[PDB]
From Swiss-Prot, chains A, B, C:
<dbReference type="GO" id="GO:0030435">
    <property type="term" value="P:sporulation resulting in formation of a cellular spore"/>
</dbReference>
<comment type="similarity">
    <text>Belongs to the peptidase M73 family.</text>
</comment>
<feature type="region of interest" description="Disordered">
    <location>
        <begin position="214"/>
        <end position="233"/>
    </location>
</feature>
<keyword id="KW-0732">Signal</keyword>
<dbReference type="GO" id="GO:0005576">
    <property type="term" value="C:extracellular region"/>
</dbReference>
<keyword id="KW-0964">Secreted</keyword>
<dbReference type="InterPro" id="IPR022121">
    <property type="entry name" value="Peptidase_M73_camelysin"/>
</dbReference>
<comment type="subunit">
    <text>Forms fibers. Fibers have variable length and are 10-15 nm width. Interacts with obg (AC P20964) in pull-down experiments.</text>
</comment>
<protein>
    <recommendedName>
        <fullName>Major biofilm matrix component</fullName>
    </recommendedName>
</protein>
<keyword id="KW-0749">Sporulation</keyword>
<dbReference type="InterPro" id="IPR023833">
    <property type="entry name" value="Signal_pept_SipW-depend-type"/>
</dbReference>
<comment type="function">
    <text>TasA is the major protein component of the biofilm extracellular matrix. It forms amyloid fibers that bind cells together in the biofilm. Exhibits an antibacterial activity against a variety of Gram-positive and Gram-negative bacteria. In laboratory strains, is also involved in proper spore coat assembly.</text>
</comment>
<dbReference type="GO" id="GO:0042802">
    <property type="term" value="F:identical protein binding"/>
</dbReference>
<dbReference type="Pfam" id="PF12389">
    <property type="entry name" value="Peptidase_M73"/>
</dbReference>
C-alpha cells in the first residue's frame, strides 16, 4: 500500500481583439441633395486588441424612411437611385499600393440585397461588376488591405507592426433623364425623400496556429498571434 | 472564432423646387378684336422650392377652335394671323439690364411649330428672327434672366438671394391689306373666329455638384444647392 | 433631373361688321324720261356688326346698254348726259349739321371714270367741283357723316351710340339745246336709250388700337372697338 503524488502547473490565457473604425468624414449627414450630386465618406480602421485582425467586412443596412412630400413611398426605389462611384481601399496609406479601386460603378440596392439578404442575383451582379478577390462567401466586402507584395506583414491591420487602414467611398445621386409625354419627368417622385444608412464593419481573426518554441516569447505570451499570417496552412 | 461589430450612421435627403408663375395681366381674356390691335400680357416668376432654378422654358399650345361665323375653319390659319411684337424679359427688375428685348417681330404659327411639334423649318426661321442665346435644343424659349454681368448670383431666379423675374409680351393682330378684284378683302374670313392659347412654363434645375466642406452648412443642409451656379464645370 | 410644369389660359376672339344700306327710294326704277327731268334717290345706312364703322365709300358702275331706237350705241355718251345735281349727306338726321351739300353740279361720266377706272383727269375734275374733304385716295366718295363738332361720337355710323345716316341724291337729265342747220337737234339721238346703274357702298373699319385696362370691359369683351375714334394716333 505504497504510493506518492507529483503535480505540475500550467496556466492558459486568451486574447482579445477590438476595432476602432473612426469616421473622420467631412459632413457625415447630408440633406437637400439633387440628382447628379456626388458625396464623399472616409473611414479609418485601427487595431485595439491583443489579437491580430485578418480582414474587415462591410455591411449595408437602411431604415427610417420618411417620404415627406414625394409620391414614392417604397424605400427600395429611393435606395436604388444612389450609385456608389468608387471605393478606394488604399487612400493615404502608401504601404504597397497607394490607391486601389475595387469598385466599378456599383449600386446600393444590389449591395443591400447581397450584403444583408444575401440574394443570389444581386451577388452575381456585384461579382460581375466588382473585384472578385475582395469578396467572401458571406457576401460582405473586404475593406482592409490584402496581398501586399512589398510588405506582406502589413496585411489585415495587424498589431505588432503599427498599421492603420484608410478607405474612401464616393456616392453619386444618379439622374435618370427620361421625359414623359405630359412634360413631368419621372424622377420627380423622389422629392423630399429621406433615408438612413447603416454602415456595419465586422473584423475577423485568422485561423488556428500550431504553437512551437519560436512562436512564443521567452515565457508566457505568444508573439505570433499579434502578427499577420499567424494561421498555418 | 472571434469577431466584433462596428456600425456608423448616415442620413440622406433630397430637396424640392416649385414655380409660382403669377399672371398679374390686365385683362387675361380679350374678345371683339379687330386687325391692327395690340395686346399686353405679363408674367411674374418666383421660387417656391428648396432647390435653385436655372432657367424657365416657355411653350405654346392651342385648342378649342370655334369659327362661329367666319369662312375659315382651319385653326392654323387663324393662329398664323397673330404676330408677337416684343418679349421683354427685364421689365421692372433693375438687376443688371433693366429691359431686354429678345424678340424681333416673331409669329405664333412658327412659335407653335418650333415649341410643340419641334419642326426644323420653324426653328430655323425663329433662330433667324430671335436672339440665339435665349434658345435651347428642346426648342422652347428661355424667359428667366441670364448672364447678369453686374450680379451673376441673380441668375435663373435662385432662392438664397430673393429674386423675382417679370416678363412682358406684346401680341398684335396683323392686318394683311390686300383687296380682291370683287372688292372684298381676304382677311374678312377671320370674322368671329375664337381660339384658346396655352402658355406653358417649365422650370429646370442645374447640373450635378461635387459636395465639399465649404459647400455644406455646419451640419446637414447644403447651402450651395440653394444658390445660382451650383453646378460644376 | 427635377422639373415642374405650369400653364396659363388665354382666349382671343374677333368681331364682325355689317352694313344695312336700305333703299327707301320713291320709285327705284324710272322710265320714259325726257330732258330736263329731275330724279330723287335715298339711302339709309345702319350698323349691323360688332365692330364700329368709320366711313362708307360709294362706287358707281353701269351695264346692260340697250339703245332700242336711238342712233347712239355708245353707253358712255348716254351716261354723260346725266348730271347729279346734289348729294346731301345730312338729310333728316339732325346730329350736328342737319343738311350738308358736298356736291356742286357734278357729272356721271366723270364719277364713273374716277370711281371705277380711277382715271386721273376725271378725279382732278371732280376734286375741282366737289368737296375735297369727302374724298379718298381710292377715288370713292365718303357718304357717312364726318367731323361732327357737336357730337364727335356720332362719326361714321358707330354701334354703341345708335346712329343711322340718311343721304339724298338728285339726278337731272341735262338738256343740250343746240339746233342743227337741218332743223333736228342733236340730243334726239338719245331716244329710247336705257341704261342700268350699279350703286356700290363699301364700309371700312378704323385703324389699330392699343388695348388697355380702361378700353376693355370687366372681363372679355372690349367696348372701345364698338365706339367711334377707336383708332390711336
Amino acid at each position: 500500500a505504497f504510493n506518492d503524488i507529483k503535480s505540475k502547473d500550467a496556466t492558459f490565457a486568451s486574447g482579445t481583439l477590438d476595432l476602432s473604425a473612426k469616421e473622420n468624414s467631412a459632413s457625415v449627414n447630408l440633406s437637400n441633395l439633387k440628382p447628379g450630386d456626388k458625396l464623399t465618406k472616409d473611414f479609418q480602421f485601427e487595431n485595439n486588441g491583443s489579437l491580430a485582425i485578418k480582414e474587415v467586412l462591410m455591411a449595408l443596412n437602411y431604415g427610417d424612411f420618411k417620404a415627406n412630400g414625394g409620391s414614392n413611398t417604397s424605400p427600395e426605389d429611393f435606395l436604388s437611385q444612389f450609385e456608389v462611384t468608387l471605393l478606394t481601399v488604399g487612400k493615404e496609406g502608401g504601404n504597397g499600393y497607394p490607391k486601389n479601386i475595387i469598385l466599378d460603378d456599383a449600386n446600393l440596392k444590389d449591395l443591400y440585397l447581397m450584403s444583408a439578404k444575401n440574394d443570389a442575383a444581386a451577388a452575381e451582379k456585384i461579382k460581375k461588376q466588382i473585384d472578385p478577390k475582395f469578396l467572401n462567401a458571406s457576401g460582405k466586402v473586404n475593406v482592409a488591405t490584402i496581398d501586399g507584395k512589398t510588405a506582406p506583414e502589413y496585411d489585415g491591420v495587424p498589431k505588432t507592426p503599427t498599421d492603420f487602414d484608410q478607405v474612401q467611398m464616393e456616392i453619386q445621386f444618379k439622374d435618370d433623364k427620361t421625359k414623359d409625354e405630359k412634360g413631368l419627368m419621372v424622377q420627380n417622385k423622389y422629392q423630399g425623400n429621406s433615408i438612413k444608412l447603416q454602415f456595419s464593419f465586422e473584423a475577423t481573426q485568422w485561423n488556428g496556429l500550431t504553437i512551437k518554441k519560436d512562436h512564443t516569447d521567452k515565457d508566457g505570451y505568444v508573439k505570433e498571434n499579434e502578427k499577420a499570417h499567424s494561421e498555418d496552412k
